[PDB]
Design a protein around this nucleic acid. Sequence first.
RNA 1: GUUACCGCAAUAGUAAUUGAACUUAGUACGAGAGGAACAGUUCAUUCGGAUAAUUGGUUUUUGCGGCUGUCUGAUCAGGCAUUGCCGCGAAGCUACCAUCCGCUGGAUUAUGGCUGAACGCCUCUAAGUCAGAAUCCAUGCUAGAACGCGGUGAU
RNA 2: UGUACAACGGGGUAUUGUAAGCGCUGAGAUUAAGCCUUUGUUGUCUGAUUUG
Lengths: 336, 226
Amino acid sequence: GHLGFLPRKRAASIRARVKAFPKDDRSKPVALTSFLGYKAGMTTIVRDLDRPGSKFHKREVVEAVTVVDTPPVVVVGVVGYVETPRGLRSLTTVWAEHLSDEVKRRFYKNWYKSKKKAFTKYSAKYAQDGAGIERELARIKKYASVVRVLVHTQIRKTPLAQKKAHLAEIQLNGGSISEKVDWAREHFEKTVAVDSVFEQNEMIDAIAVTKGHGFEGQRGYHSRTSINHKIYRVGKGDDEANGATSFDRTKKTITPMGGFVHYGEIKNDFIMVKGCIPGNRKRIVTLRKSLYTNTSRKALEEVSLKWIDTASKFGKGRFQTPAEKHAFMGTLKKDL
Amino acid sequence: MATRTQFENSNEIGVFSKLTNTYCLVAVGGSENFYSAFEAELGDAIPIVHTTIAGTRIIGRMTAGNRRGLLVPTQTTDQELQHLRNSLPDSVKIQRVEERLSALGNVICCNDYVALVHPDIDRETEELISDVLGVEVFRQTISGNILVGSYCSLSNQGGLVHPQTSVQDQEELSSLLQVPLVAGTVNRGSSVVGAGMVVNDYLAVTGLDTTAPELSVIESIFRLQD
RNA sequence: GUUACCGCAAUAGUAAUUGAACUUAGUACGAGAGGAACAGUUCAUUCGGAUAAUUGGUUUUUGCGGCUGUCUGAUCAGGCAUUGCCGCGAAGCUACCAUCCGCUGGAUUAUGGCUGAACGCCUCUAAGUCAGAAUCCAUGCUAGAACGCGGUGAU
RNA sequence: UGUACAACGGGGUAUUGUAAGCGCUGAGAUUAAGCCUUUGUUGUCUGAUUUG
């Protein structure tokens, strides 16, 4: 096979890492340069599209897709990175002076036996007349060409409960670092939804480790990188009729009847994308937006759904909604 | 105003195109250029907007229609029916064909006045042409040739068929349509002459590879000129 | 040093690759029939990376009915018949037998030159020069020194 | 000492092709051990070792 990927052995990390970022621009708003999802479930969608000159033009089309569960994510702290003729370097990590439980849980491998004394010095000491982050943060103001921001999920808000929340950082594409740093300073002890982050017809990336199988080198369980995935539908986790298209106009929960395979329903937004999102199921995945300007007739297009698959795909997928399901079944044995 | 238009790959134009006094309908092949070319000769009198058969390419031999009605088979979706209901008007009534028989344009060869039906198919399309086409309904086998919508074409001022037409069949059909005939070819001897040609009162269309004697046949019988 | 988390990037590996199809087009040019391209587009070849929903397979789900030699009183229920055969099969695991996806800029050689001697003519060259390769290097991808390093959380 | 966990059951999908027995019955048996939500039930909640 390719000598691209060498050497052979496993990806040492359960969560992958982000090895690139979109360059930056000084004249933009402060922008959230990337985000990370949870792939939950595979499915298939029918739709039609506008692609002039292609043989599918104005022509009803069917293709499978991938869904990714996406909790709106909560932000604690900022670290600016100085640049040095070696590499970057951190200056100081900062936080929200109140942290959620789970991010506390990231700092203990044994939670129950521990004393939960973690932050008291740092998070308590900031309670005061101030200056807590003043000196350091203004230092970031002076130094630190590039700036990143701590981001961490709420997994109590996901049906798979490990109680423990991951940490990551994301850059900021704004400029004149003051309204960068102030930005997230304003966003300390806050959350940031996916609204202002992405929108449809935008190519991005989501990649992660892939499906550990076993030992016969060691096959799989690598974080590979698959770019160019067109988001068909930007979900909203409060949206009734999850799968409401430009066609269907009937009520369906994107979580099927009886639930997803190994899942409860969807409490937060999601991204449906074509093709494949690497890994095995139940996965935490990385999302990097284009790294550059891709603009072309290919990426400027506009998706038009027909029907989204809400069927329960355990066994052969058959019905869709329990109302229609129970109209076609009619009365069962004990029903009515 | 004699129209030679080469459809690059396919020598049969009207397989992707169909027209009567009430419309112009062409498929999605290759560009909007072919689509909009009928203006500088026809104009927007008979509107043109692309539409297909359930997404499949060839729209011409699909349906049976003339200036009093339009008639569509089962195989289309309800959505292309929406489209033919969207821009195209209701003064030409588009009514669905429900049966096993897909190809109407490979059967029903008509014009403003005379229509036909394949004698093998039973009465449904026959009289439903009185509902939709609303024009004279009857049957003929020309040499019993398959696709009684293939070798045939009509107009107000005549019709066009290929030279294989026998005198019984020639004089026969001439009397049928109440206007003269000239058996002729198109597109340099289209193996089926009438599947690639479309025709109306003053206009009949063919390919850039069509020969001039075929066009002096076609125009000089129908007087497509002024 | 302990423990933890978040990082950095020394370095090492790299790979997306072939075809026609619209458009230009029956333009362009020729006696005539033909005849391109830049791109503006489209789908495929192939390799491999993803993913196994869907189409097919695959069940120690040994989950479920037809049943068959015999053991089980009838029944049932199972058991052997090396996983009892026809049929059904979630799931798991699979398939160019399903689908996705598969980098953008430099430095360059021949080449064409700019400028200008050497050489009182010139000359792409001697100084200096402007473009340019399926290359080299960056761009992107994969790992991350188990005696490479930064940030901060606890005593 | 909690949406903590674990299990039964409430339930939900779906596998399954009409079950002992007097048409009853697309009913039956199984169902996370690599399906799901759990207003309820029952039960558990801290051992040893080293380091700073």
